Design a protein around this ligand. Structure first.
Ligand code: AMP
Ligand code: MG
Ligand code: ZN
Length: 324
């Protein structure tokens, strides 16, 4: 059921060399992978090697894994291969700036979780799957697509020669799979609201303790949200272009809803594009800004993400004022 990369594909990745000039740029939060499509798999290999070490994973297995993951992302407008690498890069930047706060197991687990977090996404939301009783909603009662993304991740690891984690001891192996599962489930925005509120409180009252596993899990969860939404932390033109892709998917879902006789929310109605600017303002105020605000409080080095988010909020406000 899973697609598998070809030998030419993973061998080509093995020989890939990343232009010296990009090595420097990849360390920055605002880096946009957009103009280097042929290099995306190589960029991920580079980040893994820099954060986890060149011998962390058997190179051959890592290349097979990466190219098969790419092949299992669909050709949809937004939840695609580009998105996966973009989210993984934001995680890389967060980890590089807060390196020793995380174990080697967590770093390899999180970079992989980010690359795989939207595996096999079809362009339809949990809202849609549950409203229309898709088989996946029956199998996974909550965080439907996310539970599916994790299942897809495990399925790729099970492909012959694709298990990059097999060299871990049995206890570390079970630990990394759990790190990956929790990280992917955390990408369900529905869970973000409660997670952020809890973390904000733990931080404000001084009870937040990274030696407390449940606390670590929550911090990692907020990091996942931050990486998943990072298009809002890029330079304005990049942020705006990505929003076009996000809405292309929203509109397609809303079209299907109308076919089933249900009026979609304005955000998914292609006949209500005039409401987009206000919709974005709402998303930034209710989701993005608070996310990066709390993340910066817990991990000070991530402040550039919050500053960039605030800048884009201002841009959407300019659009609303007719200054576009
Ligand atoms: N700028 C945005 N405006 C509205 N919704 C967004 C925006 N960026 C991300 N999202 C939502 O956040 C979700 C993140 O979860 P996912 O990308 O599926 O892991 C996306 O599926 C979108 O539904
Ligand atoms: Mg997702
Ligand atoms: Zn995503």
């Amino acid at each position: 059921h899973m697609s598998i990369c070809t030998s030419e594909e993973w061998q080509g990745l093995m020989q890939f060399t990343l232009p010296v000039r990009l090595c420097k740029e990849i360390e920055l939060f605002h880096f946009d992978i957009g103009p280097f499509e042929n290099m995306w798999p190589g960029i991920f290999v580079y980040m893994v090697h820099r954060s986890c070490g060149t011998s962390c994973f058997e190179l051959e297995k890592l290349c097979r894994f990466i190219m098969s993951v790419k092949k299992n992302y669909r050709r949809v407008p937004y939840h695609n291969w580009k998105h996966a690498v973009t989210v993984a890069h934001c995680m890389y930047a967060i980890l590089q700036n807060n390196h020793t706060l995380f174990t080697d197991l967590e770093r390899k687990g999180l970079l992989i979780a980010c690359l795989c977090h939207d595996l096999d996404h079809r362009g339809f939301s949990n809202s849609y799957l549950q409203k229309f009783d898709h088989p996946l909603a029956a199998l996974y009662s909550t965080s439907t697509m996310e539970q599916h993304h994790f299942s897809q991740t495990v399925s790729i690891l099970q492909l012959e020669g694709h298990n990059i984690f097999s060299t871990l001891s049995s206890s570390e192996y079970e630990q990394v799979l759990e790190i990956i599962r929790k990280a992917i489930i955390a990408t369900d925005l529905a869970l973000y609201f409660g997670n952020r509120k809890q973390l904000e409180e733990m931080y404000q009252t001084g009870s937040l303790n990274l030696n407390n596993q449940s606390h670590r899990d929550r911090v990692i969860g907020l990091m996942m949200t931050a990486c998943d939404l990072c298009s809002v932390t890029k330079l304005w033109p990049v942020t705006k272009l990505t929003a076009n892709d996000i809405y292309a998917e929203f509109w397609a879902e809303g079209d299907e809803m109308k076919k089933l006789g249900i009026q979609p929310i304005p955000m998914m109605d292609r006949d209500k594009k005039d409401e987009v600017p206000q919709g974005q303002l709402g998303f930034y105020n209710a989701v993005a800004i608070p996310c990066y605000t709390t993340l910066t409080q817990i991990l000070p080095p991530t402040e550039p993400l919050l500053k960039a988010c605030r800048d884009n909020l201002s841009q959407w406000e300019k659009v609303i004022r007719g200054e576009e």
